[PDB]
Amino acid sequence: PWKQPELDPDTPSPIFGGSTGGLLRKAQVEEFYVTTWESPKEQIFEMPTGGAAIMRKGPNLLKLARKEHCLALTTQLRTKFRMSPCFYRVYADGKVEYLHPKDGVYPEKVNAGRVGVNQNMRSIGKNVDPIKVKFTGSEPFEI
């Protein structure tokens, strides 16, 4: 966004019961993902890995073992309540990463501030045959 936000350790979490679907040993060994949002009131949502949880009026915090869970929760919140949340990634050593838009106005928009990457100016099907790139290590679509 205008300034990259850093998540606060103090923020509360929604009330929930014990769910078997949740954080695993991959949270300890490898990285895990953290989702934050600011609420207007107390509403009931469904976690992507568990049941139903009543969320807190104000800031909130969710920990998800996968980024797909984080974006599923994000899409659910945006569809149901026009919520617009954001999620992060927390590594094993404590490193924090920001994957939800670095530009801040979502991938649906453009913002004229990001550079085209992995884009081919040729048409699909105009790529060369694999014989022409044989024993080179480069795929026809990677050119």
- Residue numbers of the site for another protein (CB under 8 A)? 20, 24-26, 30, 65-69, 71-72, 75, 99-101, 107-110, 112, 114-125, 127, 129-132, 134-135, 137, 139-142
Closest-CA residue to 89 (of 125, 112, 65, 113): 65
Closer residue to another protein (CB): 56 or 103: 103
Distance (Å, rounded) from C-alpha 72 to C-alpha 82? 14
Cα-flanking dihedrals φ and ψ of residue 35, to 5°?
A: -115, 135
Closer residue to another protein (CB): 34 or 72: 72
Closer residue to another protein (CB): 3 or 134: 134
The nearest distance, CB 10 to another protein, in angstroms, is 26
Closer residue to another protein (CB): 94 or 121: 121
Closest-CA residue to 32 (of 94, 85, 76): 94
Look up residue 133 and give its amino acid. Answer: V
Task: Name the burial class of residue 22, with classes exposed (0-12), middle (13-18) and buried (19+) by CB atoms within 10 angstroms of its CB.
Answer: middle
